[PDB]
């Protein structure tokens, strides 16, 4: 119960319906799923939402920086939640950095996951020999500098670029508000690990089926990254490309994302 309160765990739907767990990316929280969850409930799925430790909706006064210096602490948090909810098996939908969390958790407890759905996920953001992840180390250095120097100004610029088209004219402010509610040092240290991570070599270890979903244009996830995960995840894979631009399409263009997410879960 303290574990479930600590992560703001929310369970919606019928107790006997198939379970879908939804993880969120850096800078947002479970409210990123605000336009997705009611469709999942009305489709007779049981929806588990949670906030990763360090999110603005999470209590972080004595944040355990050591435990959360890699994704291992978040993976252990996610595993502890599934056990505390007595979930023997689930579909896991991971947005952005929660994509790798689900991959890593499935490597530790593959029995727990029928299926992974990676939304805007990337195993490595830095370019490499014949790998385009979208970023060079100089971009990251400048990115981190701007985060430390003026976090609010960095958030405003990053949120407009990450959200992309904002037709309903609310997602930039929504994403900006959850990002600015974070502790800047939690955001910095999480970004430093995530943007410089490289999980490419463990992809072949994945055994659970993976649906790969991402926008056609995403400043943080080149389309080449979706093809790369398709060819390098060790299990069954499929790619659905959303006819949108943006890193949080479930928030900014849910009408084009929800049908795809419904198909992938079922």
Tab-separated table of C-alpha atoms in Angstrom:
chain	number	residue	atom	x	y	z
A	1	UNK	CA	0.000	0.000	0.000
A	2	UNK	CA	2.830	2.508	0.642
A	3	UNK	CA	4.458	1.255	-2.569
A	4	UNK	CA	1.208	1.817	-4.480
A	5	UNK	CA	0.590	5.239	-2.926
A	6	UNK	CA	4.209	6.252	-3.539
A	7	UNK	CA	3.792	5.669	-7.288
A	8	UNK	CA	0.201	7.002	-7.498
A	9	UNK	CA	-0.941	3.615	-8.788
A	10	UNK	CA	-4.434	3.721	-10.312
A	11	UNK	CA	-6.402	0.658	-11.445
A	12	UNK	CA	-9.441	1.088	-13.708
A	13	UNK	CA	-11.792	-1.407	-15.329
A	14	UNK	CA	-13.220	-4.744	-14.287
A	15	UNK	CA	-11.207	-6.868	-11.860
A	16	UNK	CA	-11.474	-9.896	-14.180
A	17	UNK	CA	-10.471	-8.225	-17.468
A	18	UNK	CA	-7.047	-8.489	-19.160
A	19	UNK	CA	-4.519	-6.148	-17.587
A	20	UNK	CA	-2.725	-3.358	-19.451
A	21	UNK	CA	0.019	-1.428	-17.633
A	22	UNK	CA	0.894	2.035	-18.981
A	23	UNK	CA	4.250	3.682	-18.262
A	24	UNK	CA	5.089	7.291	-19.079
A	25	UNK	CA	8.140	9.117	-20.388
A	26	UNK	CA	10.506	11.654	-18.874
A	27	UNK	CA	8.888	14.958	-17.977
A	28	UNK	CA	5.292	13.716	-17.927
A	29	UNK	CA	3.256	11.424	-15.681
A	30	UNK	CA	0.278	9.098	-16.047
A	31	UNK	CA	-1.860	12.069	-17.131
A	32	UNK	CA	-0.169	11.669	-20.528
A	33	UNK	CA	-2.646	8.786	-20.907
A	34	UNK	CA	-5.654	11.035	-20.187
A	35	UNK	CA	-7.071	10.548	-23.698
A	36	UNK	CA	-6.184	6.850	-24.017
A	37	UNK	CA	-7.434	5.271	-20.792
A	38	UNK	CA	-11.244	5.649	-21.225
A	39	UNK	CA	-11.023	3.855	-24.577
A	40	UNK	CA	-9.112	1.011	-22.908
A	41	UNK	CA	-11.727	0.716	-20.156
A	42	UNK	CA	-14.634	0.774	-22.609
A	43	UNK	CA	-12.851	-2.003	-24.544
A	44	UNK	CA	-12.982	-4.232	-21.427
A	45	UNK	CA	-9.323	-3.967	-20.417
A	46	UNK	CA	-8.156	-3.436	-16.837
A	47	UNK	CA	-5.833	-0.435	-16.863
A	48	UNK	CA	-2.953	0.028	-14.420
A	49	UNK	CA	-1.402	3.494	-14.315
A	50	UNK	CA	1.612	4.502	-12.252
A	51	UNK	CA	4.176	7.284	-11.996
A	52	UNK	CA	7.888	6.555	-12.159
A	53	UNK	CA	9.837	7.790	-9.159
A	54	UNK	CA	11.065	11.324	-9.737
A	55	UNK	CA	7.999	12.515	-11.626
A	56	UNK	CA	6.553	15.819	-10.442
A	57	UNK	CA	3.464	14.055	-9.063
A	58	UNK	CA	5.817	11.915	-6.940
A	59	UNK	CA	7.316	12.827	-3.557
A	60	UNK	CA	11.039	13.448	-4.064
A	61	UNK	CA	12.254	15.400	-1.012
A	62	UNK	CA	14.885	12.749	-0.244
A	63	UNK	CA	15.260	11.367	-3.771
A	64	UNK	CA	17.441	8.239	-3.900
A	65	UNK	CA	19.845	9.331	-6.633
A	66	UNK	CA	21.966	6.187	-6.286
A	67	UNK	CA	19.030	3.790	-6.693
A	68	UNK	CA	17.852	5.781	-9.725
A	69	UNK	CA	21.277	6.330	-11.308
A	70	UNK	CA	20.294	3.781	-13.969
A	71	UNK	CA	17.031	2.252	-15.124
A	72	UNK	CA	17.555	-0.668	-12.717
A	73	UNK	CA	15.871	1.181	-9.860
A	74	UNK	CA	12.867	1.989	-12.040
A	75	UNK	CA	12.746	-1.612	-13.283
A	76	UNK	CA	12.730	-2.848	-9.681
A	77	UNK	CA	9.952	-0.351	-8.886
A	78	UNK	CA	7.835	-1.597	-11.793
A	79	UNK	CA	8.385	-5.241	-10.813
A	80	UNK	CA	7.457	-4.525	-7.193
A	81	UNK	CA	4.225	-2.870	-8.335
A	82	UNK	CA	3.175	-5.832	-10.476
A	83	UNK	CA	3.749	-8.226	-7.567
A	84	UNK	CA	1.926	-5.962	-5.097
A	85	UNK	CA	-1.058	-5.992	-7.468
A	86	UNK	CA	-0.775	-9.797	-7.804
A	87	UNK	CA	-0.591	-9.441	-11.591
A	88	UNK	CA	0.513	-12.781	-13.005
A	89	UNK	CA	0.593	-11.513	-16.601
A	90	UNK	CA	0.011	-8.243	-18.428
A	91	UNK	CA	0.505	-6.139	-21.522
A	92	UNK	CA	3.014	-3.344	-20.866
A	93	UNK	CA	2.813	-0.078	-22.815
A	94	UNK	CA	5.943	1.986	-22.324
A	95	UNK	CA	6.276	5.572	-23.485
A	96	UNK	CA	9.762	6.919	-24.204
A	97	UNK	CA	12.134	5.889	-21.413
A	98	UNK	CA	9.449	3.579	-20.015
A	99	UNK	CA	9.926	1.606	-23.224
A	100	UNK	CA	13.383	0.472	-22.140
A	101	UNK	CA	12.124	-0.058	-18.577
A	102	UNK	CA	9.568	-2.540	-19.898
A	103	UNK	CA	12.188	-4.225	-22.083
A	104	UNK	CA	14.564	-4.541	-19.118
A	105	UNK	CA	11.790	-5.746	-16.818
A	106	UNK	CA	10.750	-8.343	-19.400
A	107	UNK	CA	14.347	-9.608	-19.463
A	108	UNK	CA	14.166	-10.187	-15.692
A	109	UNK	CA	10.586	-11.565	-15.513
A	110	UNK	CA	9.403	-12.609	-18.997
A	111	UNK	CA	6.521	-14.577	-17.462
A	112	UNK	CA	5.025	-11.234	-16.394
A	113	UNK	CA	4.574	-9.823	-19.915
A	114	UNK	CA	2.363	-11.183	-22.673
A	115	UNK	CA	3.413	-8.317	-24.866
A	116	UNK	CA	5.421	-5.104	-24.935
A	117	UNK	CA	4.215	-1.999	-26.757
A	118	UNK	CA	6.999	0.555	-27.175
A	119	UNK	CA	5.685	4.060	-27.882
A	120	UNK	CA	8.377	6.538	-29.002
A	121	UNK	CA	11.100	4.320	-27.532
A	122	UNK	CA	14.808	4.296	-28.370
A	123	UNK	CA	17.673	1.981	-27.330
A	124	UNK	CA	20.275	4.705	-27.956
A	125	UNK	CA	19.953	8.402	-28.749
A	126	UNK	CA	23.566	9.062	-29.710
A	127	UNK	CA	24.678	8.505	-33.269
A	128	UNK	CA	27.237	5.782	-33.932
A	129	UNK	CA	28.875	4.068	-36.880
A	130	UNK	CA	25.892	3.339	-39.173
A	131	UNK	CA	23.451	4.033	-36.322
A	132	UNK	CA	21.429	7.251	-36.441
A	133	UNK	CA	19.833	7.925	-33.049
A	134	UNK	CA	19.419	11.635	-33.695
A	135	UNK	CA	21.975	13.222	-31.362
A	136	UNK	CA	25.681	13.917	-31.090
A	137	UNK	CA	27.542	14.395	-27.820
A	138	UNK	CA	27.805	18.152	-28.455
A	139	UNK	CA	24.012	18.385	-28.680
A	140	UNK	CA	23.731	16.521	-25.368
A	141	UNK	CA	26.332	18.724	-23.662
A	142	UNK	CA	24.438	21.838	-24.757
A	143	UNK	CA	21.143	20.190	-23.785
A	144	UNK	CA	22.382	19.436	-20.260
A	145	UNK	CA	23.921	22.898	-19.889
A	146	UNK	CA	20.619	24.551	-20.803
A	147	UNK	CA	18.806	22.291	-18.314
A	148	UNK	CA	21.064	23.353	-15.439
A	149	UNK	CA	21.252	27.035	-16.351
A	150	UNK	CA	17.593	27.806	-17.046
A	151	UNK	CA	15.364	24.755	-16.586
A	152	UNK	CA	12.128	26.646	-17.255
A	153	UNK	CA	13.404	28.129	-20.522
A	154	UNK	CA	14.771	24.731	-21.548
A	155	UNK	CA	11.438	23.056	-20.760
A	156	UNK	CA	9.498	25.565	-22.851
A	157	UNK	CA	11.739	25.045	-25.874
A	158	UNK	CA	11.962	21.271	-25.515
A	159	UNK	CA	8.222	20.821	-24.951
A	160	UNK	CA	7.303	22.786	-28.077
A	161	UNK	CA	9.753	20.744	-30.156
A	162	UNK	CA	8.823	17.383	-28.630
A	163	UNK	CA	5.049	17.883	-28.772
A	164	UNK	CA	5.071	18.981	-32.408
A	165	UNK	CA	1.702	19.953	-33.848
A	166	UNK	CA	-0.670	21.053	-31.087
A	167	UNK	CA	-3.959	21.275	-32.982
A	168	UNK	CA	-6.154	21.339	-29.891
A	169	UNK	CA	-3.598	23.873	-28.554
A	170	UNK	CA	-3.000	22.424	-25.069
A	171	UNK	CA	-0.328	19.700	-25.100
A	172	UNK	CA	2.696	22.020	-25.049
A	173	UNK	CA	1.440	23.713	-21.887
A	174	UNK	CA	0.390	20.350	-20.431
A	175	UNK	CA	3.787	18.742	-21.042
A	176	UNK	CA	5.560	21.899	-19.855
A	177	UNK	CA	3.618	21.951	-16.577
A	178	UNK	CA	4.467	18.386	-15.550
A	179	UNK	CA	8.102	18.896	-16.571
A	180	UNK	CA	8.448	22.099	-14.536
A	181	UNK	CA	6.909	20.363	-11.498
A	182	UNK	CA	9.910	18.009	-11.434
A	183	UNK	CA	13.025	18.638	-9.409
A	184	UNK	CA	15.555	20.020	-11.927
A	185	UNK	CA	18.364	17.815	-10.589
A	186	UNK	CA	16.199	14.691	-10.834
A	187	UNK	CA	15.405	15.671	-14.421
A	188	UNK	CA	19.070	16.393	-15.178
A	189	UNK	CA	20.449	13.138	-13.780
A	190	UNK	CA	17.689	11.088	-15.408
A	191	UNK	CA	18.294	12.811	-18.750
A	192	UNK	CA	22.071	12.358	-18.477
A	193	UNK	CA	21.702	8.600	-18.111
A	194	UNK	CA	18.866	8.177	-20.604
A	195	UNK	CA	20.235	10.347	-23.419
A	196	UNK	CA	23.654	8.670	-23.082
A	197	UNK	CA	22.367	5.113	-22.584
A	198	UNK	CA	22.993	2.264	-25.031
A	199	UNK	CA	20.703	-0.767	-24.679
A	200	UNK	CA	21.295	-2.017	-28.230
A	201	UNK	CA	23.233	-5.127	-27.201
A	202	UNK	CA	20.515	-6.495	-24.887
A	203	UNK	CA	17.760	-6.142	-27.511
A	204	UNK	CA	18.440	-9.643	-28.856
A	205	UNK	CA	17.819	-10.995	-25.337
A	206	UNK	CA	14.168	-9.894	-25.544
A	207	UNK	CA	11.839	-12.865	-25.962
A	208	UNK	CA	8.345	-11.352	-25.546
A	209	UNK	CA	6.466	-9.970	-28.593
A	210	UNK	CA	6.981	-6.246	-29.166
A	211	UNK	CA	4.753	-3.778	-30.985
A	212	UNK	CA	6.812	-0.738	-32.010
A	213	UNK	CA	4.776	2.469	-32.371
A	214	UNK	CA	6.022	5.991	-33.007
A	215	UNK	CA	5.212	9.149	-34.908
A	216	UNK	CA	6.464	9.577	-38.467
A	217	UNK	CA	8.327	12.747	-37.366
A	218	UNK	CA	9.787	12.814	-33.840
A	219	UNK	CA	12.702	15.128	-32.998
A	220	UNK	CA	13.927	12.622	-30.395
A	221	UNK	CA	13.270	9.301	-32.158
A	222	UNK	CA	14.209	9.048	-35.857
A	223	UNK	CA	12.100	6.652	-37.896
A	224	UNK	CA	15.302	4.616	-38.369
A	225	UNK	CA	15.135	3.747	-34.665
A	226	UNK	CA	11.794	1.965	-35.120
A	227	UNK	CA	13.201	-0.114	-37.981
A	228	UNK	CA	16.259	-0.872	-35.847
A	229	UNK	CA	14.174	-2.205	-32.956
A	230	UNK	CA	12.127	-4.258	-35.425
A	231	UNK	CA	15.290	-5.993	-36.695
A	232	UNK	CA	17.125	-6.344	-33.372
A	233	UNK	CA	14.563	-7.296	-30.721
A	234	UNK	CA	14.965	-11.012	-30.156
A	235	UNK	CA	11.293	-11.935	-30.467
A	236	UNK	CA	8.280	-11.258	-32.635
A	237	UNK	CA	8.116	-7.609	-33.679
A	238	UNK	CA	5.887	-5.302	-35.677
A	239	UNK	CA	5.990	-1.589	-36.482
A	240	UNK	CA	3.053	0.829	-36.663
A	241	UNK	CA	4.000	4.343	-37.794
A	242	UNK	CA	1.581	7.067	-36.716
A	243	UNK	CA	0.690	9.658	-39.357
A	244	UNK	CA	1.630	12.449	-36.958
A	245	UNK	CA	4.575	14.439	-35.664
A	246	UNK	CA	5.501	14.556	-31.996
A	247	UNK	CA	7.003	12.601	-29.122
A	248	UNK	CA	3.768	12.447	-27.077
A	249	UNK	CA	1.197	11.571	-29.752
A	250	UNK	CA	-1.217	9.965	-27.289
A	251	UNK	CA	-1.551	13.427	-25.737
A	252	UNK	CA	-1.447	15.659	-28.828
A	253	UNK	CA	-3.134	13.401	-31.426
A	254	UNK	CA	-4.980	10.657	-29.520
A	255	UNK	CA	-7.529	10.141	-32.298
A	256	UNK	CA	-4.762	8.661	-34.467
A	257	UNK	CA	-2.969	6.828	-31.629
A	258	UNK	CA	-5.794	5.168	-29.688
A	259	UNK	CA	-6.987	2.894	-32.558
A	260	UNK	CA	-3.408	1.713	-33.093
A	261	UNK	CA	-2.902	1.135	-29.367
A	262	UNK	CA	-6.177	-0.789	-29.161
A	263	UNK	CA	-5.117	-3.060	-32.022
A	264	UNK	CA	-1.697	-3.738	-30.516
A	265	UNK	CA	-3.006	-4.704	-27.073
A	266	UNK	CA	-5.510	-7.173	-28.539
